[PDB]
Symmetry: C3
Subunit: 336 residues, 3 copies
C-alpha cells in the first residue's frame, strides 16, 4: 500500500454534466490515478439578457469536472495555472486529509504548476474548491468548485447490503452568484476580473444572490441541453454546492435511494420528495424512471428555481403507464 510501488493510470476528464467512464464494483486492487486540471479565468454570459460574470474555473467549466476513484486509491493531481491568468489559485479537496485539504501544497501563481498525491480512504461524493489565503469566498462563488467521487470497491449498497447499480451518472454544480447592479438599475459589466472585486464583495455581504444557476448559466440544462434517459434506466444524480444550502427535487419523480450528506458508508434514505445539500458538500441520489416525459430537476425554494435560475430538465423516452397515473376526465366545463 506504499503508493510509490502501485500501478499508475492516467484518466481523461470530461465536461459536466457527463462523468468520465469508470467501473462501479471493481476487482482491481488500489492504484495511483493521475489527473490534470488547468485553471481558466474568463468572462461568461450567464443569462438571456446578456448579464456577464467575471468567472474563475477549473478546466473552463462550472462546475469543474467530476473525478472518480475507488476507496483505497491514491489521487495524483497536476494543477496548472497558465500565464494568461491574473490570479494565484490552489485546490482544497474535502476528500483528503491534512494541509488544509491540499491547499497549502498547491499554491500556484500564473505561469506555475504543482503536483499533489493523497490517499482517498473515505467513500462518498466530496467537494473540491479553490481557497487562496484572503480571497477564499470570491474564488469559490466565481465558479471554482467541483466533485470528487470515491466509490466503495464493492459498489453502492442499500441499507440491507444489497447491491445498487446505475446506468448513467450526471453531475450538477449549483452556483449562487453575486452580480452587482449600477446606479441605473442594470447589472455591471467589468473589463477585467480584478475590477469586479470591490463591488462584488459588497453584494456578497448582503447574503442575497442575484442569480442561482446550474452549471454556469440560466437554462444550461434545458431545451436542447436537457439531460436524457429512458424508462427503466437508473440514473445517479450528483449535486454539489460549495457555498450555500440547496434542496433538490425531481418533479414527477423521487429520490429512490439518497445519500444527502453524500457519504457512502452510511445507509441511504428512500422515497424522498426533496433532499438537502449542505453548503460546502456534495450529495447523491439514485432514481429509476418509470414514466416518460419531461421532468424538472430543481432547487425547491421555488423563487430560487424559477426567478433566480436553479432549474434543469430531464427528457425521458418510453411508454406511458396508466396504472401509475391516469387522466380520468380531461379539463372541461363544470356541469351545470
Amino acid at each position: 500500500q506504499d503508493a510509490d510501488k502501485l500501478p499508475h493510470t492516467k484518466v481523461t476528464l470530461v465536461a459536466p454534466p457527463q462523468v468520465h467512464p469508470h467501473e462501479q464494483a471493481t476487482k482491481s486492487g488500489p492504484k495511483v490515478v493521475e489527473f490534470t486540471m488547468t485553471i481558466e479565468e474568463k468572462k461568461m454570459v450567464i443569462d438571456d439578457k446578456g448579464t456577464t460574470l467575471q468567472a474563475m474555473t477549473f478546466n473552463g467549466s462550472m462546475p469543474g469536472p467530476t473525478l472518480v476513484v475507488h476507496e483505497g486509491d491514491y489521487v495524483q493531481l497536476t494543477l496548472v495555472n497558465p500565464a494568461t491568468n491574473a490570479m494565484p489559485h490552489n485546490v482544497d479537496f474535502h476528500g483528503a486529509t491534512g494541509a488544509l485539504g491540499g491547499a497549502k501544497l498547491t499554491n500556484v501563481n500564473p505561469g506555475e504548476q504543482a503536483t499533489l498525491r493523497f490517499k482517498a480512504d473515505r467513500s462518498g461524493t466530496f467537494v473540491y474548491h479553490c481557497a487562496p489565503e484572503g480571497m477564499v469566498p470570491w474564488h469559490v462563488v466565481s465558479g471554482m468548485s467541483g466533485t470528487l467521487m470515491v466509490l466503495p470497491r464493492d459498489g453502492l449498497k442499500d441499507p440491507q447490503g444489497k447491491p445498487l447499480h446505475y446506468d448513467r451518472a450526471y453531475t450538477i454544480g449549483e452556483f449562487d452568484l453575486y452580480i452587482p447592479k449600477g446606479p441605473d438599475g442594470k447589472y455591471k459589466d467589468y473589463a477585467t476580473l480584478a475590477e469586479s472585486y470591490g463591488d462584488t464583495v459588497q453584494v456578497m455581504r448582503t447574503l442575497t444572490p442575484s442569480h442561482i444557476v446550474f452549471n454556469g448559466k440560466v437554462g444550461a440544462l434545458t431545451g436542447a441541453n436537457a439531460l436524457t434517459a429512458k424508462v427503466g434506466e437508473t440514473v445517479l444524480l450528483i449535486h454539489s454546492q460549495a457555498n450555500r444550502d440547496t434542496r433538490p427535487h425531481l418533479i414527477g419523480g423521487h429520490g429512490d435511494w439518497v445519500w444527502e450528506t453524500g457519504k457512502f458508508a452510511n445507509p441511504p434514505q428512500r422515497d424522498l420528495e426533496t433532499w438537502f445539500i449542505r453548503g460546502g458538500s456534495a450529495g447523491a441520489a439514485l432514481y429509476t424512471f418509470k414514466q416518460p416525459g419531461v421532468y424538472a430537476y430543481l432547487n425547491h425554494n421555488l423563487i430560487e428555481a424559477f426567478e433566480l435560475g436553479a432549474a434543469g430538465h430531464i427528457k425521458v423516452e418510453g411508454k406511458w403507464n396508466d396504472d401509475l397515473m391516469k387522466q380520468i376526465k380531461a379539463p372541461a366545463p363544470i356541469p351545470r
Copy 2:
C-alpha cells in the same frame, strides 16, 4: 391491482388543523379513494394590524386540507376551479409518479374541472401544490399547498419494528409571505389579485419574507384557537413548508419519534429538540405529553417565530409531575 376493478370510496375533507378520520393499521385491501377540492381566490387579513394578502387556496384554507390514504391505494381527485376565480390552476402531488406530479393533466381555467387518478405507492407525508407554467412561485407563496399522508398498511413503526400509535393528528402548514410596502412605509392593499403581482415578485426576489405564518395568519393557532391535548396522549404533528426551510420545536417538549424528511419506510430519529423541514416537503413528529400546561410550537429561528409570526400554542390538561420538574425555590431576593 387494476384500479378500475377496486372498491371506490368517497372521503369528506375537513379544515386544518384537524385531519379527516382514518384508520392507522388497516386490514382492508387497496381501494380507490375519491376526493374533491375547490379552488378559492380570496383576500385575507393575516395579522392584527389589518395587513391583507391577495390569497389563493385549495378549499378556502391555508394550508389546503390533509388527504390520508394507505400505501397501495389509488388517489382519485376532482379539482374544481369555479368561474368566480380569475386565474388558471392545477395540482402537483409530490407523492405521485409522472406528468410533473399530475400538473400536466390538471390544467383548469376558471369554469372548468378535471379528474386525476394516481397510485400512492410510497409511504410518507408529501406536499401537494399548484404549479401553473410561468407563475409557479407566486401561486405557492400565495397559499396553494397542503399535505398528502400515505400511511403504511401496518401503521407507523419504530426502528426495531415496534408499533407506534397516535391518539390525535394535527396538520400545520407554514407560509413565508411577501407583502409589499408602499412609499409611506405601510403594507399595500390591492383591489384585485392581478394588481398585486408586479410588486409581489419584486419582494419575492429579495428572498426576505415580510411575514411567516402558521395556517394563514399571525396568531392562528393561539389563545382560543390553540391546539389541545391531555397528559398521556400521543399526538402526530404534520408540518409542511412548500417553499422555504423551517425548523420546528416544541418548547417544554421534544420530538419523541421524528421523520424530518417525512418518509415512513425510513427509521425515525428519537429525542430531538428541534427538527428540520426542507422547503418543498412535509415532515412528521410524534410526542406523548407528560406535563400539563401551555406549550409553544414554533420555528426555532426566533426572529421568524416571534417577530414574523411562525408560532402556535398547544394547551394540555392533566396533573403536574414534580418528579420530572420542580421549582425548588421560587424567585426571591438575593440573600445578603
Copy 3:
C-alpha cells in the same frame, strides 16, 4: 429514583471553550448535580475595528458554559440575576420537560435568584437559552445561550454498539449578531443596553446578520487562542446555534462520527465533510487527528466564515504522514 433521597454534588463551571471535568462511561448511580450561573449584562468589543455589542450573557461568556450530567441524573440550577443588571431573565432548557423548558419557573428580576430541578432523562447535547416573555429573540441574539450535554451512562457508542471515547472536549457557540449602522455608514455605539433595543429589532427583521462569530468575537479562536490537540488524539467538538442554521466543517479533516441533530440514542453518521446544525439546537462530532498543522474549523457558507467572522483554528502537534498526503512536485514554472 425520588430525587430528594439521591446524593447531591456541586460542580464548578469553566469558561468556553473548555468543558468542566467529567466521566464518560460511569459506574455511578443517578445523582442530583448542582450548578450555579450568574447573569451579566455587559458591553463587549466583537471585532478588530472596535465595533461593540450591548451583550447579555450567562456567567460572563458567549456562549454560557457547558453543563455535563449523565442520563437519569437530575440537574439542579440556581440562577442569579444581580442588582447591577437592568433586565429580567430566565432559562429554558431544551433537555427538560414541562413549564416551557423551565422558563415559567425561573423569572428573575434584577436582585433576585431562583432554583430549579429537572430530570435529565434524554441523552444528547441540548441548547439552553433565556426567554423572557415579549423579548425572546433579543435576549438570545445578544448572547444568552449555551449547551447542556447529557451523556449515556455507558458512554458514546457507534452504530454497531462499539464504544467511542474522546481525549478532549471543546465547546463552540456560534452567534448571528444584528449590529445597527448609523447614517454615516458606521456601526452604532450605545451608552446603555436599553438604548440599543429599537434599532436592533429593525435590523433583526431583515434576517441579515452584520456579523456571525464563534464565542463572542471575530477571531476568538484564532492565533494565540486557537484550540489545540496532538496527532492520535480524539476530540469532541460541541457546536450550538440557538437561533440560526449553520454548517460546520474542519478544513483538512472530517467528522469521523457525527450526531448532527445532537441526540446520542440515534446512530451517528460517519465520514462527513460538512454537517448541519439546525437553529435552536446543538450537535456533536468526533475526530481523531492524523496529520499535524493548522486546521480551520468554520461555517462552510464561506461568506459567513471569512467575511462575517464564523471561523476558528485548531493547532495540532505531531509528525507529518506522507502516506496520507504528499507534495510530489512543489509549485514551479510550467515547462516550456
